[PDB]
Symmetry: C3
Subunit: 236 residues, 3 copies
Amino acid sequence: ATESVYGLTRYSTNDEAIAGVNNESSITPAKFTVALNNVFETPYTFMNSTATEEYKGVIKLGTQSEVNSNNASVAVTGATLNGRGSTTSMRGVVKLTTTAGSQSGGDASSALAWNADVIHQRGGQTINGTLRINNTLTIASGGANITGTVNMTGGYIQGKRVVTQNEIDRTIPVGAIMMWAADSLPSDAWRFCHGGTVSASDCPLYASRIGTRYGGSSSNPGLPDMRLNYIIKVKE
Amino acid sequence: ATESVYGLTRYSTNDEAIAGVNNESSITPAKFTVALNNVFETPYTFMNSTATEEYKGVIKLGTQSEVNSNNASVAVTGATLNGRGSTTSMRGVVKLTTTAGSQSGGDASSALAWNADVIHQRGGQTINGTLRINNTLTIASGGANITGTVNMTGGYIQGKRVVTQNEIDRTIPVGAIMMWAADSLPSDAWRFCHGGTVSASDCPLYASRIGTRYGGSSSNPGLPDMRLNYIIKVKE
Amino acid sequence: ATESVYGLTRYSTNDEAIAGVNNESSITPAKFTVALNNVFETPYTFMNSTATEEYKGVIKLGTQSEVNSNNASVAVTGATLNGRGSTTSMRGVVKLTTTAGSQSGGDASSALAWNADVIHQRGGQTINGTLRINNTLTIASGGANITGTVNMTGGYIQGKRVVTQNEIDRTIPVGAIMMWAADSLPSDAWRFCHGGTVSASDCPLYASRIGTRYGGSSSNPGLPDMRLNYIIKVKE
Ligand SMILES: [Cl-]
Ligand SMILES: [Cl-]
Ligand SMILES: [Cl-]
Ligand SMILES: [Cl-]
Ligand SMILES: [Cl-]
Ligand SMILES: [Cl-]
């Protein structure tokens, strides 16, 4: 057999079926299935969102220095509120003192309490000690009740000069003689002119002014004897 | 035909082509294509980032108690600033009072204002009422102008004792007789010794001291008749 | 050859092997492998976590208005602490003043310092100027030492009336005559009754009361001549 004309043919072996180049034999069903098996089978807007008027946020604690400087941003604490003591130049917190002229527990930021021991303008109070006033005292009504001695440079009552003891002798001097209408004398400033003596120590002005003019001695100067009665002024 | 030698062959059927075990027939093109189709076709560093000096952050509101204790961490509010009232032991805020000795609206944390009604050391003021001083008053200049009566234990002007009315009789006692140079008397303390009487009620000391020595009666005691003129002192 | 019976066969061409419909030829190994190649080869709980008592958080800065209103939530700054000035109606911060009656640097929220120039109740102080008191002064001990003149409506020492100069003439009037025991006179209130004259300008009361009764002239009125000696009271 050939491609061209008919004739005899044998069957291919298994080896020929697999090695499919032999052109001189024919393929049986059994070697279609042999031959197939070589082919078929092979943190900024946190910290920048600050506290303000308008909006809430975050806040730095003021140092004392910042608190005292009136810093409009920082926070005031218990400690820096306490630490900002009032002074004469800076608004601040104070302790009260009820004793004028004393600080309260050594604190310079002490102010006088409502009930401090001051004298006020309404009256009815007591100063428990002395007082000095450097110019005129005017008492507008009700006078003065004074325990102890008043010393004054001058004195007038309703425009009339007050009399003092040194003036007594000018009005009626020791040594004056008058008469007397009664039986007894009410004071020893005067004595009867019935002779006898007075004591120079009892009557020092009589002794100096009159001496022994009427007898007696220097210690016991004599009185005039003028015997109504006469009387003589012997002492102040 | 065989594998070994040449000879006759028939063609396989379709069924034989598919069931490829028959070794005794040959495969045509038409049954290559039949047989193929059985094979080919089958929250900590929030809350721990706190407010401080140095750094901003977060803050607890102080209770009053913490504010008053000077807590250095918490925040002061309007309410706890207001609530921290000054006392004698603790720095704080105050109301002002212009009236010494009165709290302002019942507030114990009241301090005297700059213009409270106090007496100061500079002068020129008025106390509208009484004043008591428990020891010596010194007026250093300008004296005193006193409306009303001064009562004093003692009085001196420039070191001389002030005279009082009870001393008048010692100097010139009722009952004294002197002479007189003028035609009329300027006071009724003295009377002419021209007899007649005085009234005991007008002249009680004359009546007691002299009685009816010179005539008259107890109510109308007689004066001496000594007829310059004589005069007698009849009353203070 | 046929499907049914045996006989002669030729071999298929390559073209027949590929176009596998020819039923009248047989397939060689070489055209199994040709024919196969057409088949085988073809931001709320931030802002709502607020500051409180109990818990930390976030805070709004108080305006002054809120601070002053005692707002219990907002924050106090240096500026609003400073800005909350004490008044009589509102607790606040103060400046101190040591001068009563003056604000410190024009600040209405000025309180008297512990050492302000006030008079207190304990004594020992000085008012450097005048003082007016509108009712009675009581000095409880130690009297008064007064530089300058005291004018008073009335005066008593230990309940006895103080004597004034206008009373002198009532006790012993100008014009009185008495006797005298000494050789010389200690004052010119009295003169010897030895004739001669006094000066009307030296002795105006004698001149008015006595005139020229004893001789002389109106300018130089005569004294009595009564020639112990007589004396006459010529002036106060
Ligand atoms: Cl006698
Ligand atoms: Cl002698
Ligand atoms: Cl008469
Ligand atoms: Cl009688
Ligand atoms: Cl003479
Ligand atoms: Cl004449």
